[PDB]
Design a protein around this nucleic acid. Structure first.
Length: 68
RNA sequence: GUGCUCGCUUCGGCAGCACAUAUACUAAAAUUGGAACGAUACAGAGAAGAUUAGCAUGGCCCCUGCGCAAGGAUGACA
């Protein structure tokens, strides 16, 4: 997942650098929000897979079409 | 029942004494009931997909027609 993470980190770093180039969000709210988003998307990737049901065999046993 | 008491008493007998101490589904007999996957009778392919014919829909690519929206380039003297 490291390249998928690197793309996201690069995008959010571009956003933070554009934020900082005008010296706005001096205290650091935007960076904290972007880091929180990055961490949440990282946890989503590593979140354990959902519970998935087993499909039983249908039945051991009707008209059919015909054309081109 | 056997044997014995110095007993009564006679060998005909009697009274007492030691040993014997608790088997058995008990059973010979009573009766009326319910009963095959054994035979004959029938069936017996005792293991298969339980199908294949059209048309329309759905996907992709052109072509043509009509409509809607937004446009491009061009043409016309008396």
């Amino acid at each position: 997942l490291r390249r998928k993470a690197a793309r996201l980190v690069a995008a959010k770093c571009t956003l933070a650098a554009r934020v900082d180039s005008f010296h706005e969000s001096t205290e650091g709210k935007v960076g904290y929000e972007l880091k929180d988003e990055i961490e949440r998307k990282f946890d989503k990737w590593q979140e354990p897979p959902p519970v998935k049901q087993v499909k039983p065999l249908p039945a051991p046993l009707r008209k059919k079409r015909g054309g081109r």
